Enzyme design. Sequence first.
Site, PDB file in Angstrom:
ATOM      1  CB  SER A  59      -6.521  -0.095  -3.830  1.00 51.40           C
ATOM      2  OG  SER A  59      -6.190  -1.357  -4.886  1.00 51.40           O
ATOM      3  CE  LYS A  62      -9.179  -3.946  -4.914  1.00 46.24           C
ATOM      4  NZ  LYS A  62      -7.940  -3.332  -5.285  1.00 46.24           N
ATOM      5  CE1 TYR A 145      -7.388  -4.691  -1.051  1.00 46.99           C
ATOM      6  CE2 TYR A 145      -5.650  -4.654  -2.737  1.00 46.99           C
ATOM      7  CZ  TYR A 145      -6.788  -4.031  -2.015  1.00 46.99           C
ATOM      8  OH  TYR A 145      -6.855  -2.829  -2.573  1.00 46.99           O
ATOM      9  CD  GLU A 267      -8.340  -2.831   4.202  1.00 43.90           C
ATOM     10  OE1 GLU A 267      -7.292  -2.649   5.525  1.00 43.90           O
ATOM     11  OE2 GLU A 267      -8.017  -3.328   3.168  1.00 43.90           O
ATOM     12  CE  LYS A 309      -8.505  -0.530   1.291  1.00 41.35           C
ATOM     13  NZ  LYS A 309      -7.964  -0.452  -0.010  1.00 41.35           N
ATOM     14  CB  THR A 310      -3.944   2.709   1.071  1.00 43.93           C
ATOM     15  OG1 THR A 310      -4.052   1.111   1.222  1.00 43.93           O
ATOM     16  CG2 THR A 310      -3.292   2.809   2.590  1.00 43.93           C
ATOM     17  N   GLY A 311      -4.941   3.653  -1.413  1.00 38.64           N
ATOM     18  CA  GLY A 311      -5.041   3.744  -2.882  1.00 38.64           C
ATOM     19  C   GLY A 311      -3.874   4.050  -3.734  1.00 38.64           C
ATOM     20  CB  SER A 312      -0.904   2.807  -4.665  1.00 39.45           C
ATOM     21  OG  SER A 312      -0.538   3.049  -3.254  1.00 39.45           O
TER      22      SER A 312
END
Length: 356
Positions: A59, A62, A145, A267, A309-312
Amino acid sequence: AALDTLVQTEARKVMQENNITGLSIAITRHGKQQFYNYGVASKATGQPVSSDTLFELGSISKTFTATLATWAQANGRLSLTQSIDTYMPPLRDTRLGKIPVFHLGTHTAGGFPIQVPEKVQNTRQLMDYFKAWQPEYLPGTHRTYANPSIGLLGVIAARSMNMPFQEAMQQRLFPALGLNSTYVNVPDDKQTLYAQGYNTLDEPVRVNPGILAAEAYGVKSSSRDLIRFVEANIGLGQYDAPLQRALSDTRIGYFKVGGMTQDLAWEQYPTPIHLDVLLAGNASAMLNTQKADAIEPPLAAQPTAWVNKTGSTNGFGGYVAFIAQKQLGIVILANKNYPNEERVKLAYRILQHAEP
């Protein structure tokens, strides 16, 4: 040396506790970049992780999608206050089509499931889904989300640029930012650098093709490139006006969601920054539909804020955090989808001691 000894201790502890095979960290402090690489990209090759190892961003992708949109906007090709059907003809006379484009980046257009429904297996079926969509709440009243809405932002942006999304990202946006090892589609001779993911049973896996995957979660990058993308968002780079505006515009604050401010995909958390608040805003419960309060006029980019931002994906876990005013940034990229809370604590611990 002290900072390097600290990073190593924190990095090793988190890898031990979460069974991480490879980990790449980069930090930037007033333009000075430092790189910390641990473990291996693949158990099979034994290749060590480096700052040019490619990881799946999940993510974090994004934020690039959102930057595509504001760049489009800064070139006169897309006003984000306009209705979706201004810039997407097939949604003329639809419920979704009436809603302003920016709600797609802020997750507030009206309620979506987190994934594109499994019944959608091609672009025609995706259009029909958006045509048949009905809101559960009015635009901007709640935040949900979701890859469908974000992914549609990407579609819109690329349509405004007269080209496919992959071309808009890989032949325009990424080179414009000076990202030379950042990809939706990894070419053959770069294939050797693409880390193996490890899943919940510690088995090898990489993310699959899917509808709107490119637009929502399909970027692969190195820590060396991603910390350059962090530096662009801090305000380094000396890009031309439209790109500089694009970067800044992604970090406009549009909604308050509990303790978090919702930007375009980014965010953020205003000062005083406390760990407890960062942990709360990055928890898995935040994916559920939350009450949201509109910021009108929207908040200009806040130098003092912690932006993140987190991404997974199934095999990978990433995290990006930076504060523009202190020119302080971090990228943490791992081949394990480990708890967001450990990612945030790790970043918080490192940046706490990185700054004198």
